[PDB]
Symmetry: D2
Subunit: 213 residues, 4 copies
């Protein structure tokens, strides 16, 4: 894991019955906790739901970990790691997602599956009324020998107000690593640019681990 | 929809990272609320998780509806209907599932996707310690012009005790149908026979709609 | 526990900051699974929230248990039992409640505490837009040597539609009793009459235990 | 609200049927985001449950708010504010709590009610196996004209591992105040000293508001 790394991904999913495929190519700085990616809808264009529900699915290797907190993710390579996540929205929408992350040369490959169910037809996801995710702080703790992260996430909505989602992600190293004590990862994710129907999206994330107050 | 109907299905899914395909062929009696199916694992054998998590995913057409409760499901054909479901287990395991149900001649075809995440590695699902689902009563109510069913489900476990799961299923007719008032559907599902690793399973369900006490 | 029993109760609670006391006197038939009660607001009249949230707090002794299902509740007397319940509404409202049930002569005394928080100010509870609870089926199972009941409950709302609440009640006998296997209790509760601000309410419940389909 | 303020409180509650009263006296620095309190069990000693479940119930006035984030709490006085909270533990334990906060001279008075239900008898709360709350980051957002804070909280347990609780607190000013945009409050709470059965406890909290990464 070098100061500069490339990223490639493929997501296949279904949300509200709508099948899609998205591919991404980007780059990031693992030790600065930053990454940027260009994403293209390859099947199912135009997506009928809020693109924002996908974006946090598009790798905690890209998080700046201070010396005092063991870095579960960077420690996991070359073998790498996978994660699974549930996203429980406050109106009963539920998404499941996974990523199997491999490293070849200077490039992370991401094999992703995303599924979304029970979104109300007049809700902000199906009506595409989301603006952005707010920054967040993920709570990281060991459970059954692997790392779990829980996050209170919120989408800022058109015309004001927020739409809440609770994330639970289970991260699993493919080798033994030094496990961290309870800690936090601050995140900020943003769509830098997109075209009209989000067929093309440029995405960015900054993340930094810390020990709280 | 005749007194006797055939059923065919294909499920593709991933649970705990493990990819699989299962195909099923069966028959049922829509007006008696009964059905039986033979299921075969076509890819991913042997499944590393409790087969029981799948079984309720393997069609509320097969539910005996009395004259006084509009039958959302039978009314929906020939066009048919689809459903989406989240299954929230008490230990944080979450599954998402969907079925798109079509009718050709005397045969229902079921296109199914199933995804499971966040199952604890020492839990009853990953350790295959489930015996059966208990019978249940699904609560059916209209929400946003479509039908929602919520169920408090429980797996009876090896060595006693239960493992709870909450189902929320959204059922969507592909045409206009007379919508029912709040009602119930009693269910009982059972694996009639299986081989050692559940590569072959014979499954049965009985369901009856009612208006409660 | 005779064919006819009297009931007296006192509830103290706070909902949305509003303190109240309600007292009740009634009668029921334990073996027929029926009871009726007259309730009077003694402090905090007029209640600023939907009275319906209280009613299921105003004793599973009054449930008709068939010979084949051990009756945890009737078995518990003369010593009696207590219960605790959480009520999780779909809009984030949460109530907690408890009842300590004693028997003196032919009369059950009920010491009740009820607390409600996080109800949205424009929601159906604070705006008093509830009509009734729908009938329900409670799922009963043993957990840690005591009985747990889970219920998918729904309030029918003014102008149509439902408002969902999930009940979890833990029932604790004050002596050893034969524990039942997994079973169900059907319920129907209804306000028979009330005055304008629900200062006076006549309430009824019918409940019957069964083994499902 | 001065650089130094006094605090007095009274909590009445019931957890697992066990009634108690606790009184507290302390002091804090509202603009430094710190406070300390001495708490005494006045009724129900010795408490049969983990004292830690109470501690975050023992005032966001004591949070350091930077100039760029409107301070909902400090703005609310002299009239003051109240809050309600639900605490949803991962094993089904649920607590409800409220605080009505008044200011007289240099002293905040806190009228508190706390109720806890559905705690498993062999769980860490009833078995008193909690060590401390981990630091946290509360997510603050406006909803229905008032402020809501959600927190992923975790108790560190004896012998390792964590026990998760999700907090939702609704904060209500008793006058009009400038409402803040989405923000965060970092918290750290600690028991500085206690006697054997927690009849006497010295408690401390540090909290700082921020805008995330």
């Amino acid at each position: 894991i070098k100061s500069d790394m490339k990223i490639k991904l493929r997501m296949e999913g279904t949300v509200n019955g709508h099948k899609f495929v998205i591919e991404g190519e980007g780059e990031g700085k693992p030790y600065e906790g930053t990454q940027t990616m260009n994403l293209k809808v390859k099947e199912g264009a135009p997506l009928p739901f809020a693109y924002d529900i996908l974006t946090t699915v598009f790798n905690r290797v890209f998080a700046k970990y201070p010396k005092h907190i063991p870095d579960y993710f960077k420690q996991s390579f070359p073998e790498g790691y996978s994660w699974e996540r549930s996203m429980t929205f406050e109106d009963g929408g539920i998404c499941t997602a996974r990523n199997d992350i491999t490293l070849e040369g200077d490039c992370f490959f991401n094999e992703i599956r995303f599924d979304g169910v029970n979104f109300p037809p007049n809700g902000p996801v199906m009506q595409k009324k989301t603006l952005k995710w707010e920054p967040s702080t993920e709570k990281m703790y060991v459970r059954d020998g692997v790392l779990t992260g829980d996050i209170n996430m919120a989408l800022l909505l058109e015309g004001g107000g927020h739409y809440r989602c609770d994330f639970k992600t289970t991260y699993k190293a493919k080798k033994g690593v030094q496990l961290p004590d309870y800690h936090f990862v601050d995140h900020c994710i943003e769509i830098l640019s997109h075209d009209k129907d989000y067929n093309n999206v440029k995405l960015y994330e900054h993340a930094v681990a810390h020990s709280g107050l």
